[PDB]
Amino acid sequence: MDKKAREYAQDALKFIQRSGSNFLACKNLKERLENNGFINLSEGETWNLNKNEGYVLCKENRNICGFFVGKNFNIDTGSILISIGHIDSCALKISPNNNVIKKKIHQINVECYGSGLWHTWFDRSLGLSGQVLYKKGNKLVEKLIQINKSVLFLPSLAIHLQNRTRYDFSVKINYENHIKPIISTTLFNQLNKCKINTDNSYPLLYLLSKELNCKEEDILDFELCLMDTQEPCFTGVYEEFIEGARFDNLLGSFCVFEGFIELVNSIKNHTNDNIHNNLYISIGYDHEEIGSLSEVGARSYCTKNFIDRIISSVFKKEIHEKNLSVQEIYGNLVNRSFILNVDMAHCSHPNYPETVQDNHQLFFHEGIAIKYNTNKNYVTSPLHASLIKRTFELYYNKYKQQIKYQNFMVKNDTPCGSTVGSMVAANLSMPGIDIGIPQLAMHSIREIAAVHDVFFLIKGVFAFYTYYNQVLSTCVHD
Amino acid sequence: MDKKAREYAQDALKFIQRSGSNFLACKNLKERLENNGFINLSEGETWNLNKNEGYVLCKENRNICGFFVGKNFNIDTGSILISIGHIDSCALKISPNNNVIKKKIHQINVECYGSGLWHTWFDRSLGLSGQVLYKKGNKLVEKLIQINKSVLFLPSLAIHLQNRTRYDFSVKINYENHIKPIISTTLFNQLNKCKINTDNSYPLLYLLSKELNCKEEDILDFELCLMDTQEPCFTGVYEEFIEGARFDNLLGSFCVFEGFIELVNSIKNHTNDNIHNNLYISIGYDHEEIGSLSEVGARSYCTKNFIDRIISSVFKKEIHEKNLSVQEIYGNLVNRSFILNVDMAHCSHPNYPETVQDNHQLFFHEGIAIKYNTNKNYVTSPLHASLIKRTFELYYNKYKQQIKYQNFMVKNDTPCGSTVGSMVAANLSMPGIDIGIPQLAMHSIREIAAVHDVFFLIKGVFAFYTYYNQVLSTCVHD
Amino acid sequence: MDKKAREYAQDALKFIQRSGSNFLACKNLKERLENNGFINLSEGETWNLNKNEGYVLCKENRNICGFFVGKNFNIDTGSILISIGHIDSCALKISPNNNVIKKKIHQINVECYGSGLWHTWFDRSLGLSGQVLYKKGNKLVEKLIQINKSVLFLPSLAIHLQNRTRYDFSVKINYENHIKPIISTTLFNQLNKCKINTDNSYPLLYLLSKELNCKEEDILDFELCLMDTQEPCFTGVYEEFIEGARFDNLLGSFCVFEGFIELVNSIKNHTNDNIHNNLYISIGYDHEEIGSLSEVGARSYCTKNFIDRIISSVFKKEIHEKNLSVQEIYGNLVNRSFILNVDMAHCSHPNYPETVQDNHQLFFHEGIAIKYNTNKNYVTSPLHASLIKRTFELYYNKYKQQIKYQNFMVKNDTPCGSTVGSMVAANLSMPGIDIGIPQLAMHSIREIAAVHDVFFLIKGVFAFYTYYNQVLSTCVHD
Ligand SMILES: [Zn+2]
Ligand SMILES: [Zn+2]
Ligand SMILES: [Zn+2]
């Protein structure tokens, strides 16, 4: 696994450093799915879905959703298997009116998107990734940009100005005042000008026009996210960790789609009856960090309408002549359905032993977290994790490679952030689980994670895809 | 009513003391509905619904939903009448990794489910109820257990160790540290062993294996809730109250289904045109105490897909040949629809006169609460309570037994907990009301309530079922 | 010992559940002593005591004191062996003026007797035990009542009214305002009336008149204690603990008298010279929880006058003709005398590791506590515990059953509650020790204790009775 765990983390470290925002997360995953032969269908034309074919759609370039229709569906004995991991992170997005000129320094005022460690974003060689809408002729042209060179810097305050050396000197980052990255000075802005809107920064507008090869006056408005220009890398002495940026479920949703790609490649190659019996959906949501209340979030009707469009297009012919309905067929498959929500989990911090549960601890290379909660912030029920642990045991009987797992639970007094596990499980009425891999410094600009956990997560989504209905057929209720 | 109010509270006190958790709430209600002849249909086969027949389904053994299709539906003049009361309570559920050995004492670390008076759970002879998944051969066997003997104890701290006798000695229950029930000592665990997983407690695993008659190594994982082993009983001098446990809408949802059973028995017996004209649904939700964001909660798509499966299966033949749709038929019945959310309400505490409204007070044996709210935490609108108060008056004209009611409203400065009234009224787009019966010490391990209110609630759900369309036909808007 | 430890805890669990107060503690112990043949003598007639006979007296039905005069007393070489355990507990006693009618609910206002965990008394199916004085003809008739059905309930506040879910929601039990159990409503009080004093509650006066079979107007005044109606039971998985109520030295003083009964049965049966040489007194005190300043407390002259009445009646003939005095004879026997004070001790709480000493810890089934103190709140001196540990070793040489012990000491910074060890050791000028058995949640309504400790305590009082003068004869001072 040492070789396959490093090869899995290598491709994840090719995915991140190209996935600088939520837009290039949808773009690079759609490019990753189209390399295996997925038919890229748009939401706006018409859906004529076929058996045995895989499909992919970016809903308005924020929400990736790739699904694979099995060969023999059975309305009677079949399932809809969904793996979920949001494609976004806590980033400093750029405000619309950004022209801050203070102390002879051109600045951007950025909006803090999500709930992040914003003091870690201080003193970073920052870049740009996101979506820019610009004019070309009479047509609005949309381009996803990726500026991997350092063009922004959020400077900290020098230590000499406040009181020093005690209780970490009472550091307080005011989110409006102190979080405003510098981009240029007014000296070299005017020096690089002689060789229309006053709301956009001309150092910024010169930068995007250099990337898009147009005038700065053609740049209309943009949704840009600040990213750290430092490439992700294997760390530790033994090159045993991974870290670069955005590992809050951009590493995790890589394993959602890498586990989904290996499933479809296992279906298409070497062609055993129940693998062609399911609808395997793999959706990368947006706007998780702010609560999923969006048109492309988890609380959206997007996924629920996607399944009701797959059911209507696949079973187009059997609605008419045996008088079934969509909600009859959808509620028929919901009993055999499942949701595998993948989002990162808190590894046991060695420097903070007071924020960890005693029994439910997570360590690196120890396996997938299975995140439980008091208040169902994670949707894991002890029945529905027992089915997934038996999919990990059916993986061990066939591939002779153990998928390790470990139960994670936050302390009863401390609160924890909710995920999209129970959001989609309420929208789709499907049972669910919340798994993920342990990482340290979650919601920060650099997040460290283990490379064996990337192997266990990719095989963990693949084992849930392959062996869920083999476990579900053996469950007898009263 | 004295005889019928005690007989109603007697069967409720048979329902509780068998309903130790949310799983045995679904199980005993499904057994209570199947005794009247309800056709138990599963979500996974196919729905061929008939007129005049009653149906019942436990969605994955947490969410009970019993409905009765009337004899002559009318898409033009007909209704969907839903009564709602969640089947769950604030309980100490058992964590997955439970092996706490401290001070030579085997402990369970429990997770505080819901928002309860957890200091009342201290010093109780505690039992176990819930769902246990265990192996038998190669098959995962699911069993709902009920351990009515005291096998757990959450001990308090002795009074001598802190400061004493003033302002109740500054009692602070740390939810992680201090809430960990003892189960055994290491002396008698080792003494009862000589005559695989290290995460589960062997005193607990010996206990469940004794109930399931298998090895302790076959017990995989379980969703167990701690309950109080003391049986509920009639209290007061005149045997005029009821109390045992879990009366936060396990008594209330008993009256939802006992009011539903008496309706269906009134439809089947003595066979006046509008009683066969409606779809009477009675659903017992789960996960209310944590906010209903679950696959079996009120925010789920489960109930909305259930009605769209009833409409599709009952009107299977009229979709095809007059070209109606489900959402056309569902939105047609939503104008005549109603939601009767039943959850317990705060009786006027005599020892706390500063937490009560002056005019909106609730007293025992005074009637059903009709819970109003500022922020619509309760879904009661003053129009839609006026229709229900006229169903209580149509009950008085036929049965000559007055259904008493009283309006309940929390103070403007104090906040109150939201219920599932507005959650399902948003999911189903149906108008609603929040009724319930006054009880003291809500969300505690022992909750006292009045036996005349159990009579008024059972007749209150029955009067809403019988006489809503007779009231709704007499409403003239402009 | 497993069989004998369960048989000892079985009879203790027959003693408690009949011993609901301090009055029925004196009554049931006097019935327990009279079954072995103890001559019940009253304080008011005349004391003609005999050798070889056992006597028992309830001083005004609160203070039990059973003693056994040995066959051959020796003023020269003889002793007075006293075992002490108070018969009372922290209970909610009923106030004289109890007519609280607030929010249409009949209430009792109760007085908090002792220093108890009064938040554990909330939400309990509460009963009544105590002494009721009522008229019958022209004669004041005294009756000890025991109402084992739930007739009272102290309700808590619902969780929704205050702030929630943090630091246990700032629970504060005001001892006057919030501790007032409900007993009835004014609806069913008036409903059960049509089918003189305004200070007594008519729901209460109807209840006691139903038990005494007289009019409510004959009930004059009463000393009633609220008790929990739940019967004590063996708990744990292995049925290894005991808990029901009042285990603060009503379990402990059971072992005082059960150890005393087994002594007298060892003296009368199998009839070796020094067992008939002592005055074995076993006294159950009252009013310990409030500081023993009473006519039946430990600070009373009752015990000191009892010994001076035993010495005067046994040695009635030798005072006259060799010109001895009572204080000469009493101070002669005080040098060989001992006091075995038995009161419960704090087991090491697993959920509170900051309130325990590191070295002096108490665990369940580990033996008798031997409670030491800094300030002599416990009367244990390291000389006088060394004699008792040698009585435990002389028990092991004869019966081949080890009496385990463990030293208990509270932390130096924390204070601990004083016992009646040093109170009676000052009143009688006898050396003493404070032993007891470890229990959790002392001074609460449910207190858990171990069943092997009940065996060790009963054999511990019996070994002090049998083998103290064999140890005391081997002590050589300088
Ligand atoms: Zn995330
Ligand atoms: Zn409730
Ligand atoms: Zn005591």
A252 contact B CB<8A: no
Q: How many Cα atoms occupy the beta-carbon half-sphere of C109 within 13 Å?
A: 17
Facing residues of C153 across strands?
C125, C182
Q: Contact C350/B177, CB-based, under 8 Å?
A: no
Q: CA nearest C364 in B: which residue?
A: B185
Residue C332's region, left for phi above 0, alpha for psi from -120 to 50, else beta, is alpha
Residue A153 alpha carbon to ligand 1 centre in Å: 25
- Subunits touching C (CB < 8 Å, at least 3 pairs)? B
Quick check: helix, strand or coil at residue B223? Answer: strand
A325/B306 CB distance under 8 A: no
> What is the distance between the alpha carbons of residues C10 and C234, in angstroms, rounded to a whole number?
9
- Solving technique: cryo-EM
d(CA A210, CA A221): 16
Q: Is B357 on the interface with C (CB under 8 A)?
A: no
With beta carbons less than 8 A apart as the criterion, state whether C75 and C332 touch.
yes
Torsion angles phi and psi, residue C147, rounded to 5: -105, 100
Interface probe with A: pick from B177, B293, B325, most Cβ of A within 10 Å:
B293
Q: How far, in Å, from the CA of A89 to the mean position of ligand 1?
A: 6
B167 touches chain C (CB under 8 A): yes
Spatial contact of A296 and A63, defined as CB atoms under 8 Å apart: yes
Pick from A323, A326, A303: nearest CA to A428 = A303
CA nearest A218: which of A127, A139, A129, A108?
A139
Nearest residue in A to B327, CA atom = A327
Distance from Cα A248 to the centre of ligand 1, integer Å: 4
Closest to C5 measured CA to CA, from C241, C233, C237: C241
Chain A CB contacts of B305 below 8 Å: 327, 330-331, 334, 429
* Assigned token pair, B291: 């906010």
> Distance, in angstroms, between C207 CA and closest chain B CA?
6
CB contact burial C350-366 (16+ within 10 A = b; e otherwise): bbbeebbbeebbbbbbb
E strand map for A85-194: 91-94, 100-102, 105-107, 110-113, 125-136, 139-153, 182-185
Contact (Cβ atoms closer than 8 angstroms) between residue A62 and residue A22? yes
Q: State how far Cα C414 lies from the chain centre.
A: 25
Q: What are phi and psi of C393, to 5 degrees?
A: -80, -30
Phi/psi for A343 (5° steps) reads -150, 150
Alpha helix (H) residue ranges in C91-159: none
Residue A328 and residue B313: Cβ atoms within 8 Å? yes
Chain B residue numbers with beta carbons less than 8 Å from the beta carbon of C414 are 161-162
Q: Which amino acid type is present at position B469?
A: N
Q: Which amino acid is at C367?
A: G
Asked if C150's CB is within 8 angstroms of B185's CB, the reply is no
For residue A55, what are the β-bridge partners?
A39, A67
In this structure, the number of other CB atoms found within 10 A of the CB of residue A124 comes to 22
The secondary structure of B381-405 as a DSSP string is: -TTHHHHHHHHHHHHHHHH-----E
| Beta-bridge partners for C143 | C132
Distance from CA of A316 to the nearest CA of B (A): 15
Contact in structure between C103 and B361 (CB atoms under 8 Å): yes
Determine the distance in angstroms separating the CA of A326 from the nearest CA of chain B, rounded to an integer. 9
Q: How many angstroms separate the Cα of B436 from the Cα of each of B245, B354, B432?
A: 17, 22, 13
Pick the CATH number of A90-230 from 2.40.50.140, 1.10.8.50, 2.40.50.180, 2.30.250.10: 2.30.250.10
Q: What is the DSSP letter of A272?
A: -
Q: For an interface test with B, which of C94, C163, C235, C374 has the most B Cβ atoms less than 10 Å from its Cβ?
A: C235
Helical residues (DSSP H) of A167-201, grouped into ranges: 186-191
Q: Looking at this protein, which amino acid is placed at residue C218?
A: D
Q: Do C351 and B179 touch (CB under 8 A)?
A: yes
CA of B172 to the centre of ligand 3 (A): 24
Pick from B154, B172, B153: nearest CA to B162: B172
**Distance set, CA B373 to CA B338, B377, B419 (Å):** 18, 6, 11
How far is residue C215's CA from residue C205's CA, in Å, rounded to a whole number?
9
Rounded Cα gap, residues B154 and A78, in angstroms: 45
Token digits for C96? 């004289």
Tell me the H-state helices in B342-450.
Answer: 384-399, 421-428
Neighbours of C317 (CB within 10 A): 8
Q: Check: CB of residue A220 under 8 Å from CB of residue A212.
A: no
Query: Which string of DSSP letters, residue by residue, matches A16-84?
Result: TTT--SSHHHHHHHHHHHHTTT-EE--TTS-----TT-EEEEEETTTEEEEEEE-SS--SSS-EEEEEE
Give the C-alpha separation, C341 to B309, whole Å: 74
Rg of chain A, C-alpha, whole Å: 24
Overall residue count recorded for chain B in this entry: 478
Radius of gyration of chain B (CA): 24
DSSP C64: E
**Sheet containing strand A345-346, strands side by side:** A233-235, A241-243, A448-450, A438-440, A345-346
User: With an 8 Å Cβ cutoff, are C183 and B236 in contact?
Assistant: yes
- C-alpha triplet C455, C459, C461: angle, nearest 5°: 120
Residues forming CATH 3.40.630.10 domain(s) in chain B: 1-89+231-478
Helix, strand, or coil here: A382? coil
Q: Which residues of A belong to the annotated binding site?
A: 86, 248, 288-289, 343
The dihedral over CA atoms of B204, B205, B208, B214, expressed in degrees to the nearest 10, equals -170
> Token pair of A478, please?
């009263």
Distances (CA, A) of A262 to A32, A257, A269, A280, B74: 12, 8, 10, 12, 52
**Cβ–Cβ under 8 Å, residues B301 and A339:** no
Contacts within 8 Å (CB) and 24+ apart, C294-300: C295/C60, C296/C59, C296/C60, C296/C62, C296/C63, C297/C420, C297/C423, C298/C84, C298/C86, C298/C420, C298/C423, C298/C424, C298/C427, C299/C423, C299/C427, C300/C63, C300/C427
CATH 2.30.250.10 segments of chain A: 90-230
Contact (Cβ atoms closer than 8 angstroms) between residue C153 and residue C92? no
Could you give the 3-state DSSP secondary structure of residue A227? strand
Determine the topology of domain A1-89+231-478 in CATH: Aminopeptidase (3.40.630)
- If DSSP states are collapsed to H, E and C, what string results for C272-332? CCCCCCEEEEEEECCCHHHCCCCCCCCCCCHHHHHHHHHHHHHCHHHHHHHCCCHHHHHHH
Q: How far is the CA of B252 from the centre of ligand 2 (A)?
A: 8
Amino acid identity of residue A58, one-letter, is C
Is B160's CB within 8 Å of C346's CB? Answer: yes
Q: How far is CA B380 from the centre of its chain?
A: 19
